[PDB]
UniProtKB/Swiss-Prot annotation, chain A:
Site description Transition state stabilizer, residues in chain: K11
NCBIfam families: ispD (TIGR00453)
PROSITE patterns (alphabetical): ISPD
Family annotation (PANTHER family): 2-C-METHYL-D-ERYTHRITOL 4-PHOSPHATE CYTIDYLYLTRANSFERASE, CHLOROPLASTIC (PTHR32125:SF4)
GO CC annotations, alphabetized: plasma membrane
Pathway: Isoprenoid biosynthesis; isopentenyl diphosphate biosynthesis via DXP pathway; isopentenyl diphosphate from 1-deoxy-D-xylulose 5-phosphate: step 2/6
Keywords, alphabetical: Isoprene biosynthesis, Nucleotidyltransferase, Transferase
Nucleotidyltransferase listed as a keyword: yes
Protein name per UniProt: 2-C-methyl-D-erythritol 4-phosphate cytidylyltransferase
Reaction it catalyzes: 2-C-methyl-D-erythritol 4-phosphate + CTP + H(+) = 4-CDP-2-C-methyl-D-erythritol + diphosphate
Organism: Mycobacterium tuberculosis (strain ATCC 25618 / H37Rv)
Site for Positions MEP for the nucleophilic attack, residues: R141, K192
Length: 208, 203
């Protein structure tokens, strides 16, 4: 079984052509055809708005304060008895994420990979820079990748990952507990909608 | 001390973003900054004549070369007396004039090599040849570099003794300083950029 968690962490909840971004992300998930269930994971404060809108549709769980609290809590609920085989975690602001991408992630989990991110080559030269604005070096662009969501995991791994802490990107948790994570093509359409420019692009895209 | 700008473009240059080719937009942005005195556009020899018809008094045109670095030497070679040289990517047609002023300003403040740069929307990861994540260099202050990149001519010249100019300057030992870029300065490449470009240019 496959369950996606869309954590609410305002932005995810802003409007885009008659739908909040998080509604669209959730739909992009359901329509992938490979996702059985979406939990929306929201802090207490936003449980009313989350219910009116995403009213199942999806499971709602609420809520910690941090993003990681609400993912943790959601992890707690996906539980044991009805525990799914795989769990995706998807950024609500990646509202235009293509279903194929989604399926491409699930297919890799189905193929043994316990952890999987969608990834794109970098379009700009990348430099490492210090606090005083001085270039520290220019790492090789090949070798480096930009990563998107949804990120997919065997739920056992992601549970474990999260439990470790204390002591953003979910895969970096896995990476921290020494899990190995694998890569699949992303899609520019899956950009995080963060700015007016972002929005502008999102707008132009939906009504094309 | 004069400020010159080179636009190595040797088919992005001539692509017509609703009514103006990107080369003309790139050239205007450099001009509107108010601190660029000369622009040299390098294009393939086949297109040398046509690029003149487009740009007129705005840019002296020179013929290109095989790769990029190759032409830049040539473009460079032409002049043959500026103090600062900017190199700019014509694919960044919607660069704001301010960003260029910000680059020119840093040069006048002593820094011999300046580049505009931006924080990164997505998490960057290091990935090996098999698609296995090596790690997340979140602590390295990674940055997305833009153009125009600016140098003292003297420094840019020594450097020419892979499309990122500043790399050579770091390669001869020279230190490069950063200023803030601007997302408007993005590189128009993918179909999505084209759409982004349109949305903006006609907003």
């Amino acid at each position: 079984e496959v369950v996606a968690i869309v954590p609410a962490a305002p932005k995810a909840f802003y409007q885009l052509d008659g739908q909040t971004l998080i509604e669209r992300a959730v739909d992009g998930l359901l329509d992938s055809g490979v996702v059985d269930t979406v939990v929306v994971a929201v802090p207490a404060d936003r449980t009313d708005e989350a219910r009116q809108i995403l009213g199942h549709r999806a499971m709602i769980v609420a809520g910690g304060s941090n993003r990681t609290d609400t993912v943790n809590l959601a992890l707690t609920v996906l539980s044991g008895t009805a525990e799914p085989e795989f769990v995706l975690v998807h950024d609500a602001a990646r509202a235009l994420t293509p279903p194929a991408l989604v399926a491409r992630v699930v297919e890799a989990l189905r193929d043994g990979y316990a952890a999987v991110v969608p990834v794109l080559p970098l379009s700009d030269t990348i430099k490492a820079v210090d606090a005083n604005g001085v270039v520290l070096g220019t790492p090789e662009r090949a070798g480096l990748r930009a990563v998107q969501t949804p990120q997919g995991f065997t739920t056992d791994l992601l549970l474990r990952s999260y439990q470790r802490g204390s002591l953003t990107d979910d895969a970096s948790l896995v990476e921290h507990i020494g899990g190995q994570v694998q890569v699949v093509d992303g899609d520019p359409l899956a950009f995080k909608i963060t700015t007016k420019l972002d929005l502008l692009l999102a707008q132009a895209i939906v009504r094309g």
